């Protein structure tokens, strides 16, 4: 029922995004969809308030059926019709909340440019899946959201085992 769960999504709230600051601070609610990085293995993300939604009577909500087997690229190209295309594209919009968000200066070469780094959704879910399935073990684990992972995103709500971060420890002398 991937047409029903879209009118669901949009009604509850619905913000598909491939970049957010909810992975940094859960008090954030800033969501941007980048048009230029959607690739064949790009894992897209979504958010509704309290991560609300209905399943597909097989146990999976919108997020896992949209992450499974490039279904987001399938709809985004238009292989499942143009009536799902405009719904998915009107789902992906913009949101701006620099609150709770790190703000650093970066040079433009002849001046400065105040820059807010937010997390990547494809990088997080794709890194968890790949560094679990090729068994990379020099790494960390971070559960985003705390004891209620339905707050941050939908990826948070589903992957409650914890997102994987690279262990960036350098060598120590002596």
């Amino acid at each position: 029922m991937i047409k029903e769960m879209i009118e669901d999504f949009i009604s509850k709230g619905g913000l598909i995004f491939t970049h957010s600051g909810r992975y940094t601070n859960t008090n954030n609610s800033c969501f941007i969809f980048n048009k230029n990085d959607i690739g064949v293995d790009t894992k897209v993300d979504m958010y509704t308030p309290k991560s609300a939604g209905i399943k597909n009577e097989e146990g999976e909500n919108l997020w896992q059926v949209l992450n499974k087997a490039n279904m987001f690229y399938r709809i985004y190209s238009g292989e499942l019709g143009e009536e799902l295309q405009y719904l998915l594209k009107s789902c992906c919009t913009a949101k701006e909340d620099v609150t709770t968000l790190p703000q650093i200066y970066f040079k433009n070469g002849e001046g400065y440019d105040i820059l807010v780094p937010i997390g990547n959704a494809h990088n997080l879910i794709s890194g968890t899946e790949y560094l679990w399935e090729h068994k990379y073990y020099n790494t960390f684990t971070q559960k985003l959201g705390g004891s209620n992972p339905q707050n941050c995103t939908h990826a948070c709500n589903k992957m409650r085992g914890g997102f994987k971060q690279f262990n960036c420890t350098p060598p120590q002398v002596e």
Binding site: N27, T99, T100, Q103, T141, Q172
Partner: protein
């Protein structure tokens, strides 16, 4: 004029403590500084969990980190630095017609009393916490720049007037009110006993091997720098029905005791700050509290 707050008003940490470093020395010869080794101890006890009485005939096996003095040395040496920076009324995020008018509303606090209760917690030894209990003698050596200060017996609860805490307090207050750094190389000695247990900061982790993980730097025991900072800012005796000093927080809260002493009674940091910017007559204590939080810092979202 309703000088309403910015979205996030962010102040830097003006006390800048470092991690304490736990060493084992003797009381007489305080020069063979050997590191306090964090060890790995596996225990056998019993379950003893609330409402689980049908598992109480079983045991629990818990691997814990332990840090003890070696049984040739009888004094725990705690070494950290405390860097009092003063740029107190300068904001990282925000600041204009809210931080400047707070600066010209907080310009007449007793910075000497704030620096006094700041230095006293480093001098009475509140940075040791459970290292301070059971010690026969807690002699602390504070080395401000080319000026060695020593303290050996201070009541940690009551800020009794000393003549050498106040001398450090003058230069720390002059830096806090003005600019610069008056960094406190601080040396703690506790006559605990031969082979007594020392108590480093425990890491809030999710360790599968260990049930209690102690903070270790290279393997040597250590205490957290924010733990030391929480000890230094434990100055607040200006809340309702004050008994003991607590850490200055935006709501005067300790999450360990499960009670907030400065919330729900219009005495929180944001209410007093809002009164200060729109124009009120703050008393000396709740003005000292607001500038103590400004030295503490923190994002003031809302």
């Amino acid at each position: 004029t309703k000088l309403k707050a910015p979205a996030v008003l962010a102040y830097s940490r003006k006390i800048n403590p470092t991690n304490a470093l736990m060493f084992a020395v003797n009381w007489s010869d305080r020069d063979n500084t050997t590191a306090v080794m964090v060890g790995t101890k596996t225990v056998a006890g019993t379950q003893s969990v609330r409402g689980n009485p049908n598992d109480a005939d079983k045991g629990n096996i818990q691997t814990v980190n332990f840090a003890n003095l070696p049984h040739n040395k009888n004094t725990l040496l705690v070494k950290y630095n405390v860097k009092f920076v003063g740029d107190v009324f300068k904001a990282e995020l925000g600041g204009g017609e809210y931080s400047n008018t707070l600066q010209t509303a907080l310009e007449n606090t007793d910075f000497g009393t704030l620096a006094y209760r700041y230095v006293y917690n480093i001098a009475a030894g509140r940075t040791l916490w459970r290292n301070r209990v059971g010690a026969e003698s807690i002699e602390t050596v504070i080395t401000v720049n080319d000026q060695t200060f020593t303290f050996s017996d201070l009541l940690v609860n009551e800020f009794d007037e000393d003549v050498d805490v106040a001398e450090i307090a003058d230069m720390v207050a002059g830096v806090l009110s003005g600019e610069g750094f008056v960094t406190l190389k601080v040396e703690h000695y506790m006559l605990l006993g031969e082979g007594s247990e020392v108590f480093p900061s425990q890491e809030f982790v999710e360790n599968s091997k260990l049930s209690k993980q102690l903070f270790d730097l290279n393997g040597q025991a250590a205490m957290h720098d924010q733990k030391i900072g929480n000890a230094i800012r434990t100055i607040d005796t200006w809340y309702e029905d004050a008994t003991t000093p607590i850490a200055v927080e935006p709501y005067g809260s300790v999450v360990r005791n499960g009670v907030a002493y400065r919330a729900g009674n219009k005495t929180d940091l944001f209410t007093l700050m809002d009164g200060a910017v729109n124009g009120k007559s703050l008393t000396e204590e709740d003005q000292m509290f607001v500038t103590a939080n400004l030295i503490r810092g923190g994002v003031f979202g809302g």
